[PDB]
Structures are given as C-alpha cells and as structure tokens.
Amino acid sequence: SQFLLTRLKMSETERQSMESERADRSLFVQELLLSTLVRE
Amino acid sequence: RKAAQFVDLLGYFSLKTPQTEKKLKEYSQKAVEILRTQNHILTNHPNSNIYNTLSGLVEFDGYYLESDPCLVCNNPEVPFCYIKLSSIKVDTRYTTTQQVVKLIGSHTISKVTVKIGDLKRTKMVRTINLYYNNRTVQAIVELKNKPARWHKAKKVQLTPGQTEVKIDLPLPIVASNLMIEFADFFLCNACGFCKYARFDFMLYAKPCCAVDPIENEEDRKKAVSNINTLLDKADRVYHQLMGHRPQLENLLCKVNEAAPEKPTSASVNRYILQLAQEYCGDCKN
Amino acid sequence: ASNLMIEFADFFLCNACGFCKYARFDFMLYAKPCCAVDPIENEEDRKKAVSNINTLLDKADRVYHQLMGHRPQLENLLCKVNEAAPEKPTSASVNRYILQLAQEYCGDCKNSFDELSKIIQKVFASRKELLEYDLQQREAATKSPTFTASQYRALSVLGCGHTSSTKCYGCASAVTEHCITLLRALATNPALRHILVSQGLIRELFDYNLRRGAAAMREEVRQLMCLLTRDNPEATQQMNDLIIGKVSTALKGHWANPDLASSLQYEMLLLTDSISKE
Ligand SMILES: [Zn+2]
C-alpha cells in the first residue's frame, strides 16, 4: 500500500452524455447486425 | 527483485517533473532498450524450454537448473523466531555459579527472555552476565576456561522477586557457544540441579551462516583446508545436480506427445507425475 | 437364477438352525453377475413390469441429467488449464487445475456413467421380457405364417442388442482403427498401393490420423504412410512437400510462439521413419 504508482471521477452532465452515447452505439450495432441477416 | 522501491520512485519522479521532449525521448529509449535486452535474454536461455514447459504442469517456486547459483535468489530475507534453548542445545556443563551451553550451529541472537519458576526466598539472582563466542569446540570442558575465550554481551540487574527478564541486545550477536554467570546473589557441579529456583531460557534468533574467526597463522591454514573441502563437496553436488537434465528433457519430450494411456490423484498421467517427482523432489534438494 | 434349493433324495438337518451332525456341506459356484428380471406369466405381472419400468426410466432420467450437468465445469477447467499460468505452491506439487480435472472426470463422471449404464441395462432386460411376453400372448390368441430361418432371427428378440449408437466417439475410434489396419494390409499390393495413393489417401492420413489415437495407432499410421510411398517418386515428393511446408510455416512464427516449434514432433518422426527404410 506504500507504493506510489498503484494510486495513479466524473461529473453528472458528462455522465448523461456518456449514457446517451452508449445508447446510440447500441442502436448502431443493432442495425449493423440486422444488415447482415437481410435476404439475398 | 530488490529494486521495487527504486523503480517506484523513478516512475513517480519522472511523472511529476515537467521535462523537455529530448529528456523524455532519452528516458523512453532507455526503458525500451532494457526491456528488449531482457526479452532477448529470456527467449534464448538454455533452460528456457524446460521452464516454459514445466510452468503449465507443475507448481514450483524457484529455478533449480542454474549453472551459477545466484546470490540474490539464494538469499531470501529470513525473519527472526522464538526458539527455546534446549531445542538447539548439544552439550552443556554446569559449575557452582555459571552455566555453559553449546548449540547445534551458529545463530543470530537478538533478545533473551528468561523465566523463573519454583523460586525460593532463600536466595535469588541479582545480576546476570551473558557471554558468547563463535568458536566451535567439541568438548565443553575445553571451552570452560573463563577469561580468554569469552566476550561480554550484557549485564542485567534484577529487582528482588523477578520472574521474567528481557535481556535485549542492541546489536544482534552471531554466537555458537553461550555462557550465563550469576554475579551477585547454587548449582550442582555434576548434574546442575538447583534447589533455590528453576531457570528457563528463550531466544529471539534465526539460523546464521558463519565460521570461526581467524587470529593467527594455523587458523588461516585450517580455514584454507576447510574451504578446499567445501569446494570439493560443492563440485560433487553440482555435478550430481547437472546430471538430472537429460532425464528431464526426455520426460518433456515424452509429455509433449500427449499420447493417451489407459489405467483420483493416481489417475494423472504417469509422465506428468514423473516430471513433478524429478523436478520438485530431487532437483530441489 | 436368484433363489436355489438343494434336496437330498436318496439316503439329518435341524428345522430351526440347520445343524447337521452326520456331515458338513460347503458350496462353490462358477458364476458371474447377471442383469435379468422376473418372467411374466399373467396380467398383474405385466402391470408390475410396466410400473417397474416407469420407475427405472425416471431414475435413469434423473441420473442422466445429473451426469450432463458436469460439462460446464469441465469446460471451465479446460479453459483455465489451457492458459498454463505458473502457480506458486511430490504428488501434491502437480498443478491444482490438473488435479481438479482428474477428480471431476475420473471421479464423478465415471460413477455417474456406471450408474447410468446399470440402469440402462436393467431397462433393456425389462423391455425384452415384456416384448417376448406380448409376442407369446399375440401368438396364443392368433393360434385359436411360415418364416424362414433368417426371418425368425430378424423378428425375434435374438437380434436386438448388438447395435452401436450412431453418435458414439468410442465406436468411431474403433472403426478408424479397423480402417487403418485394413489399409495397411491392402497397401502391400503394389497395384492397390498405386490406386490408394491415386485416391488421395496420403493427405487424409497426414491431416487427420497423424496426431489422433493411442501411441500404437499413431505409429501404425506412420508406418502406413511410409509404405504408401515405398517406390513412388510422386508420392514421396507429395509427402515431402507436406512435411516441408508445415515445418516452414511453423518455423516462421516459432519466435513469437514456441508451441509452433514444439508441435512438429510427428512430422519429424515421419521423416525419420521414411528415411530409415532403405
Ligand atoms: Zn459405442
């Protein structure tokens, strides 16, 4: 616990932004996966 | 493995100090160069194949197939322990007011806790003197001679009625034979029985590797002869150790094939068990 | 048999304890355990057989589920073993994950498999008895069509218990062993050897059977591959091309992965065996 290097926070607005970005990334991956199942 | 704190401080200071780009480039180059050199050493080591194969099969602490034994890896940090004197005692002789003891070998003694039981009001000890020496002798009566061959360690005075006393040594002493003297107020000369009280001894010690000191010329000659004998024994043991490698490589070659064998601690592959017995059993010893 | 009786017809025993003063009798049998059930003679016996078979099926289902529940733990242990991470601590100094794998497979799966096999054998015997009784009753009712010798065996219960399961690992292994033995026998004819090498057998043996099976099977496959190229320059060139290609491909990435360099033992053994035969 005395090692200094082992010890080498986020606000709320950026938390909302991160959650929204996670949402759009999920939607994009969903549509990308749907695109590979289309009929040929 | 001794340089954990050094690299900790080096990383911290390099991270906290603002520096020019040239210094940063030099530092990164040094780090990457050391890493590359160590990786190259690892991948071409003669024992690298054996260790790499053994790592995933057996559980072993150290590397016991090294030509030159490493002083760093051979010398771990041994801690002190509480040892009772009688467990390491070999030969003992008592006199009217002293006690002389010899141990199995050398020891690095730090503290001595002395306990007293079945004491009587008739007579008790007021001053205890401790003596030590690191000269190995075969007969206690030979070392019984008082003045010349002893060193003063500590003098402790006791309040009347004391039962336990803590003889602390500011500097740990490397000793092989010990002596306790009752300076101020008893013991049987033949058997050492004491009717006034019963004394028990404890030590805060750990095993130590040391030899007798040299004071004159015949001692130097004895040291040279002893070192020659030790070198011969070490050479024999080293050859016996290095003789194990062909069998280990044969077993590794057989294990690599992984051929199924028909017949739960006994249901492991026989070659894996032989590998474990050969490495962790004999090479370790 | 399940119960036995011995009668002294022509010439004694205590009615309560069975002590005999005239002589002392001791018995030995040349026997072995047998899986059989009571015969069926009437209808309540059939009902009892049906109930017993239902109970046995339920027990077998429970044991089967308990057996198949072991697979996830086995695959987790296999995944952990494949990493081969060194662990710090002579029969106890072997890697703990290997000990756990041995205990899980040879200790518990074996017991579950044995219990399942016992229950399956009992169920099979009960089914055979029930089907025989049904056939006899149907014949008795019909008696109030000639069959040839082979048709009788086909219809009767004689031809019922000698067929292997379709998805069986051990049986497929045995069939591969028989195929290797037969092909080794066939290859001793030069014309058959040429036809076999024209079929493309060398690549199939090189890619599949070099590393699979017991050690004896592996050596036999090596011997067959050597024999297939006994006096054929084209087959020898093909085998040499396969060996050289594999060794070069492995040696290219040997530096970044040593298992590539240490998994060439069978190719080099094949080369040694081919060269050693003049
Ligand atoms: Zn089968």
From Swiss-Prot, chain A:
Membrane-spanning intervals of the chain: none
What superkingdom does the record give? Eukaryota
State which tissues express it: Spleen, small intestine, ovary, peripheral blood, lung, kidney and pancreas. Expressed at low levels in the thymus, prostate, testis, colon, heart, brain, placenta and liver.
Location of the protein in the cell: Cytoplasm; Late endosome; Lysosome
- What is the induction note for this entry? Up-regulated by FGF2 in gastric cancer cells.
Basic and acidic residues bias: where? 9-23
Annotated segments matching region Disordered: 6-23
Q: What does this protein do?
A: E3 ubiquitin-protein ligase which accepts ubiquitin from an E2 ubiquitin-conjugating enzyme and then transfers it to targeted substrates, promoting their degradation by the proteasome. Together with UBR4, component of the N-end rule pathway: ubiquitinates proteins bearing specific N-terminal residues that are destabilizing according to the N-end rule, leading to their degradation. Does not ubiquitinate proteins that are acetylated at the N-terminus.
Which protein family is named in the record? Belongs to the KCMF1 family.
- Subunit notes for this chain? Component of the SIFI complex, composed of KCMF1, UBR4 and calmodulin (CALM1, CALM2 or CALM3).
Q: Which protein, by its recorded name, is this? A: E3 ubiquitin-protein ligase KCMF1
Q: Which organism is it from?
A: Homo sapiens (Human)
The shown range, given as first to last of full length, is 289 to 331 of 381
Swiss-Prot record, chain B:
This protein's source sits in the domain of life called: Eukaryota
Localization, per the record, is: Cytoplasm; Cytoplasm, Cytoskeleton; Nucleus
Q: Which residues form the signal peptide?
A: none
Task: Say what the protein does.
Answer: E3 ubiquitin-protein ligase involved in different protein quality control pathways in the cytoplasm. Component of the N-end rule pathway: ubiquitinates proteins bearing specific N-terminal residues that are destabilizing according to the N-end rule, leading to their degradation. Recognizes both type-1 and type-2 N-degrons, containing positively charged amino acids (Arg, Lys and His) and bulky and hydrophobic amino acids, respectively. Does not ubiquitinate proteins that are acetylated at the N-terminus.
Q: What is known of its domains?
A: The UBR-type zinc finger forms a pocket that mediates recognition of type 1 N-degrons. In addition to substrate-binding, the UBR-type zinc finger probably positions substrate proteins in the proximity of the bound and activated E2-ubiquitin conjugate to enable their ubiquitination.
Subunit structure comment from the entry: Component of the SIFI complex, composed of KCMF1, UBR4 and calmodulin (CALM1, CALM2 or CALM3). Interacts with E2 conjugating enzymes UBE2A and UBE2B. Interacts with RB1.
> Which family does the similarity line name?
Belongs to the UBR4 family.
Linked disorder? Episodic ataxia 8: A form of episodic ataxia, a neurologic disorder characterized by episodes of poor coordination and balance. EA8 affected individuals have attacks of unsteadiness, general weakness, and slurred speech. Additional variable features include twitching around the eyes, nystagmus, myokymia, and persistent intention tremor. Inheritance is autosomal dominant.
Q: What is this protein called?
A: E3 ubiquitin-protein ligase UBR4
Gene source species: Homo sapiens
Recall the taxonomic lineage recorded for the source organism.
Eukaryota, Metazoa, Chordata, Craniata, Vertebrata
Q: Which residues of the full protein are shown?
A: 3463 to 3809 of 5183
